[PDB]
Amino acid sequence: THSHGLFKKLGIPGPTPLPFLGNILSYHKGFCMFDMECHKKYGKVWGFYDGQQPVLAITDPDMIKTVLVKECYSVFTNRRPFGPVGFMKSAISIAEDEEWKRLRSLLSPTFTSGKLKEMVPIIAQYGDVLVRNLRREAETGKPVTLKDVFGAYSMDVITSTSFGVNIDSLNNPQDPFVENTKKLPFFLSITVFPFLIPILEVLNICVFPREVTNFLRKSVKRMKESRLVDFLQLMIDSQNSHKALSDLELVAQSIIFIFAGYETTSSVLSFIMYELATHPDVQQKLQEEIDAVLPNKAPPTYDTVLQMEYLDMVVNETLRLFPIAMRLERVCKKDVEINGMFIPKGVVVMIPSYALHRDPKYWTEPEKFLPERFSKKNKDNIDPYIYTPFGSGPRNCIGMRFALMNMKLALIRVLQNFSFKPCKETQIPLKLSLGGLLQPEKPVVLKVESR
Numbered sequence: 001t002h003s004h005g006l007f008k009k010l011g012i013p014g015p016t017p018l019p020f021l022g023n024i025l026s027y028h029k030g031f032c033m034f035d036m037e038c039h040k041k042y043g044k045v046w047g048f049y050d051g052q053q054p055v056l057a058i059t060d061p062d063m064i065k066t067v068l069v070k071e072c073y074s075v076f077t078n079r080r081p082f083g084p085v086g087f088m089k090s091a092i093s094i095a096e097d098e099e100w101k102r103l104r105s106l107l108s109p110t111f112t113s114g115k116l117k118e119m120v121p122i123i124a125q126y127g128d129v130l131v132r133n134l135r136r137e138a139e140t141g142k143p144v145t146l147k148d149v150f151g152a153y154s155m156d157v158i159t160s161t162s163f164g165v166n167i168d169s170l171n172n173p174q175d176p177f178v179e180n181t182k183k184l185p186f187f188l189s190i191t192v193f194p195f196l197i198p199i200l201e202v203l204n205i206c207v208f209p210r211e212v213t214n215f216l217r218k219s220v221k222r223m224k225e226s227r228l229v230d231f232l233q234l235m236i237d238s239q240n241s242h243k244a245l246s247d248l249e250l251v252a253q254s255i256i257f258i259f260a261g262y263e264t265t266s267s268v269l270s271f272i273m274y275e276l277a278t279h280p281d282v283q284q285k286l287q288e289e290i291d292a293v294l295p296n297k298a299p300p301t302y303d304t305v306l307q308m309e310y311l312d313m314v315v316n317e318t319l320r321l322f323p324i325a326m327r328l329e330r331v332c333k334k335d336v337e338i339n340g341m342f343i344p345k346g347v348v349v350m351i352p353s354y355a356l357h358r359d360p361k362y363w364t365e366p367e368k369f370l371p372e373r374f375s376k377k378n379k380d381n382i383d384p385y386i387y388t389p390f391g392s393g394p395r396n397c398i399g400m401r402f403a404l405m406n407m408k409l410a411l412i413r414v415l416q417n418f419s420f421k422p423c424k425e426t427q428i429p430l431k432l433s434l435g436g437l438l439q440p441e442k443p444v445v446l447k448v449e450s451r
């Protein structure tokens with residue numbers, strides 16, 4: 001301190017930082033609105049201070065390719081550290097440098113196309129659970145909360161896909177597993193006082209309720225020693241040129257996949273149904289393609305799902321509006337120059353996906369929901385270093401192919417059977433949480449009707 005001179009030195013524009021807070025008071029209207037502003041106010045690059053922490057925002061497609069890909073293993077290997085985490089330093093989204101490069105390898109073959117295809121039947125089962133719970137609310141002409149019934153499903157999928165556990169978490173009951181995964185303002189006080197993290201690290205306060213982890217650490221070694229098709233198996237099988245996956249390293253990834261596939265796959269499905277409801281022609285047009293490919297509500301398979309192109313367009317276009325991650329970020333680990341610009345050591349290099357997904361200089365009518373942007377006719381003109389809902393380069397979303405497949409299966413079954421209509425209590429237009437997650441302000445609630 002005071003590092004508050006750095007962007008002024010480098011000749012990089014940005015909002016003036018108050019002392020000890022930097023520009024955080026600017027987060028009051030959400031990250032996303034702060035970025036769209038800085039984008040319009042400052043141009044292709046700009047800088048700011050999460051407290052003392054210089055952040056440099058970059059928007060050039062080459063520069064972005066340079067960072068996420070060309071210079072990844074060398075400079076931009078790790079994300080910004082948050083804490084305290086404790087035994088979850090070892091998880092892959094969190095681990096650093098070579099310990100990450102190791103973990104990526106041991107868990108890469110798990111997410112192969114082939115391995116995903118064998119997951120299709122188990123993921124097909126709980127689609128049926130989802131419909132039945134839906135009809136129980138469709139026959140009772142009462143509006144529905146989507147995050148609940150979708151979460152009940154996303155949860156249903158994770159537990160089976162990662163450990164084989166088989167529950168109907170919605171109704172079926174207080175089953176021992178639905179609950180420790182229920183614990184599925186502290187993160188703002190980290191930023192003004194990140195010098196407090198190692199304090200908490202010697203205090204073993206886990207941002208994970210310290211008890212859940214104790215449940216799954218022990219719940220894992222029960223399953224481990226009961227068997228001795230799912231992720232736990234695919235990981236136990238891996239630990240049988242890199243030291244093998246340890247037992248706690250195994251518990252920690254299981255956790256990272258449950259946070260991954262749960263309030264992401266649940267949230268996105270919600271965002272997709274909202275758009276399908278407020279846009280009934282797209283709903284019908286998709287229900288058609290679904291019925292032409294799967295006549296008679298024929299069960300989808302892995303191959304039929306990669307055959308629905310409109311489906312893919314609705315998914316991509318939605319994730320254009322709602323890129324759950326909002327920003328991507330990497331820590332610059334060394335003095336570097338990229339595409340003719342000095343970047344000094346320690347700076348956090350941030351890419352604002354949300355404000356690029358909503359940039360008029362790359363998107364005509366960017367607030368509108370137009371799936372045609374992703375027709376095979378126009379999908380080619382889309383700069384891949386602007387549309388990045390799963391990241392890019394070696395450190396992108398390892399669970400990309402599974403999430404897409406997981407979500408697409410849900411929609412197919414559900415649009416085969418119901419249509420979705422606004423209620424008077426629907427929030428139109430939907431407004432994003434002014435907070436710090438990509439969720440709707442108010443929960444998405446609609447009317448479900450049976451075909």
Ligand code: HEM
Nearest residue numbers: 092093257260261264325389390391392395396397399403
């Ligand atoms: C629609 C759902 C999802 C979206 C939009 C999404 C998007 C992302 C993004 C943007 C990142 C960071 C990429 C980067 O920094 O370049 C990421 C990372 C990650 N995702 Fe996903 N993700 C989704 C679901 C999942 C799922 C279902 C899994 C399944 C286990 C998963 C596992 C991971 C992991 C482990 C990382 C960290 C990668 C690493 O550091 O090596 N994600 N995801």
Ligand SMILES: CC(C)(C)OC(=O)N[C@@H](CS[C@@H](Cc1ccccc1)C(=O)NCCc1cccnc1)Cc1ccccc1
Nearest residue numbers: 078079080081082093094095208256257259260264325397
């Ligand atoms: C801070 C550093 C650089 C050391 O670690 C990260 O920043 N990592 C993430 C931090 S939040 C965290 C939620 C959590 C809650 C409780 C325990 C662990 C984690 C996550 O690890 N979630 C991955 C699954 C997932 C979620 C969404 C999409 N894909 C996978 C942010 C992030 C992850 C992943 C993508 C973008 C940001």
